[PDB]
């Protein structure tokens, strides 16, 4: 449910 | 007819004031980002300088520690004068390093820290706690609190 | 007349007797510009060579020995004065260069059979400083605000205006140095007050008593010591050091030239160090070479010794200040603020003298060495264009952002960002098959999820299934007008948007800006370390998930018992004693080839 | 009052439109100046550190010069090892110096240039072209064309005759 981050 | 001018002028004035405030805020944020970029460039330059500066101090300190302290006597005036000058020079070097954020790492007896210390070897030592720096093979350095070069330490093991 | 339509950049130039400083308005604060050699302060020295040259600054100082009769320094003591004047008659004898009388009976100078007024030397200095400003700016600096001492009469102020005009500068106004210092210290927007400007450190000591009645500055009185400056303190320290060295060894460094320069620099650093530290050491290896061998200077200097060396010089600043208060018709209780200007005022002894003399702890929140130029820049920014509009532009108190899979605090908008700003960033889904995306908005300065605050929280429901990392969600903050934050989450490609209008956008306006960032700097390297730890954990978990998914795809004739490095990776995961797992992330082996 | 108020408001609208144009010009100028400042801070920015280490470099050179070099013998082995360590330290500091753009200025016979040289005396010297550098008392340094420390030289003067 936690947003990810674009690498 | 003439009343339409009021509505048009009010709408245009509000739109233009919004655009002008947003454009006057864009330049300030760009200025702060540019300041951050310049600070990053300065920090990188100083870090790259210090990384190769460390070898000079290492060589000087090794040279001045090789000479035994029992032979710095008055019947060898040239060795005594050179030793005094060189120890004063490395004190000057370390003072200059400290002034510019570069701090030494000599954790004699301090608890082990993977972010500052590197375990060259593991060997139990009597009278010392486990996971504690019994001997420092090579001195480390810190730049603004971040480890520029980890110290090569000896970690006490369990016997 | 109507608005002059300046529409340009106004520089603030501090034209000093010895050293000049230039600054510009960099938005809401003034910035002192460094010259072509990277120094923030340029000497007011001009020189002319045999054929023709105009060396200004340190190039003129270096050449001064070869050309002593054509190097003009401290010409600001000749500006606006006639040739037949007492002070000019005292000054002409000492100066190596030639001082002549003009047709109008004014004290001019001569260089290789050419006549220059004392305003023209300042014009050359101002040309150099305008070039310095333009190099940083990138465009021409047409307008300027030039500071003069408070004891200048109208003739000398007009001479300064003419000097500025000669340099191609549109001098908006000629300001005082006490008034510029007050503007830099921020007393322009204050109630009616009487303030004292303590100026020690230059080539002169100046004390001016000011009044800020009605919102404008009036110079009630002026005084000081003409033959007292910051060079005398350094000279006293250097004399003490060389006397101690001769006493301890027996060699006088005055005859030596290189050793004297080394000791002078060491004395300057030692004096600068005895303002924050009680004690200092002066180490100078190989100072002099004798027939008996080199001599190394090693001195221990404490603050008590230093403040006893220069006690007479500091005491020479008590009669002028008392007389200045007498001229202003004020007492200790009538002074509402004390302002420290000059580099020599950083010692606690000078500040203690000022406090004992005016009854008020001096204001030391501004760099005294660059206060006049900064105040001139502030005045120039106020006078022309629109700088107050950027002054009323409210900025965010604390940084803002959203959550992250590994608990990281992803910073969209940083701390000191002007409010009417929209910033957007695109984020992917957490895991494969994930359809629900939740945004956790929080404010602070630490690099952690829940370690700062929690403003609001919403959810983006409805996402087509896709492999992890492929869906793109554009989280955009829409801080608009002044205040409230319009956080919105956008699912790029499809619909099902979300929004929130979270309040308390710095509503608790207090010293949290001063304290929350105070402990966010001490607890920074540890915070960075734990953030890097969680980033490595996330990367290793993703790699192991990819490896497991690829392994469960190909099973037949697969002797991958050697491919069990994921066991070692998991063992490393359950260990809070390692720097990072990036180095052990080499577990992406795909010898099976799908 | 309606018509004059409308005219004044339209004038204010045009003024703030010009303000918006000025803001766009200002942010473009800021982009250019920022790209300049970043390169400037990449070249320099070790200027303070270099200016602080100049004296260490000079002290190491002076230490190499001061030892009489007649006592560097196998009879005195500890003074020999210390001398070799000092020599290695000097070459190391000069190798890291020139790696980061810090170059030494030693104008033995160059023309006097009051941008990298600080004249110490104007003594006349025979056989030397007037205006040249007679001797260099202290070597100067510069990084990337920025004169950190001038070379303290002595310029020659024309013969009085």
Numbering used by the authors:
A (entry chain D): 435 to 441
B (entry chain C): 59 to 217
C (entry chain A): 46 to 639
D (entry chain B): 59 to 219
What did the published study say regarding this structure?
In human mitochondria, mitochondrial Hsp70 (mortalin) and the nucleotide exchange factor (GrpEL1) work synergistically to stabilize proteins, assemble protein complexes, and facilitate protein import. In bacteria, mitochondria, and chloroplasts, the GrpE-family of NEFs interacts with substrate-bound Hsp70 to facilitate ADP and protein substrate release. Herein, we present structures of full-length human mortalin in a nucleotide-free and substrate-bound state in complex with full-length GrpEL1. To stabilize the complex for structural analysis, we introduced a point mutation, R126W, into mortalin (mortalinR126W) that is associated with EVEN-PLUS syndrome and has been shown to reduce mortalin’s ATPase activity and conformational flexibility.
Further refinement yielded a 2.96 Å resolution cryoEM map describing a complex consisting of full-length mortalinR126W bound to a protein substrate and a full-length GrpEL1 homodimer. Firstly, we observe an expanded NBD devoid of nucleotide that is mediated by extensive contacts with one protomer of GrpEL1, termed GrpEL1-A. Secondly, we detail the significant bending of the GrpEL1 α-helical stalk domain that enables interactions between the GrpEL1 stalk and mortalinR126W NBD and SBD. Finally, this structure provides insights into the interactions between the SBDα helical lid of mortalin and the second GrpEL1 protomer, GrpEL1-B. Critically, the lack of EM density within the nucleotide-binding pocket but strong density within the substrate-binding pocket suggests that our structure represents a previously unobserved intermediate state and suggests a step-wise mechanism for the nucleotide and substrate release action of GrpEL1. At the first interface, subdomain IB of the NBD contacts the β-wing domain of GrpEL1-A via a salt bridge between R107 in mortalinR126W and the carbonyl group of P172 in GrpEL1-A. Here, the mortalinR126W IDL is proximal to the GrpEL1 α-helical dimer with residues V435 and L438 within the hydrophobic IDL interacting with L82 in GrpEL1-B. Compared to the predicted GrpEL1 structure, our mortalinR126W-GrpEL1 structure exhibits a ~ 13° bending of the GrpEL1 α-helical domain. We observed strong density for a peptide bound to the SBD substrate binding pocket, indicating that our purified complex is substrate-bound. With these factors in mind, combined with Hsp70’s propensity to bind hydrophobic peptides, we modeled the bound peptide as VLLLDVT, corresponding to residues 435–441 of mortalin’s IDL region, into our cryoEM density. Second, we observe an interaction interface between the SBDα helical domain and the β-wing domain of GrpEL1-B. Here, Y173 from GrpEL1-B inserts itself into the mortalinR126W SBDα, forming electrostatic and cation-pi stacking interactions with R578 and R574, respectively.
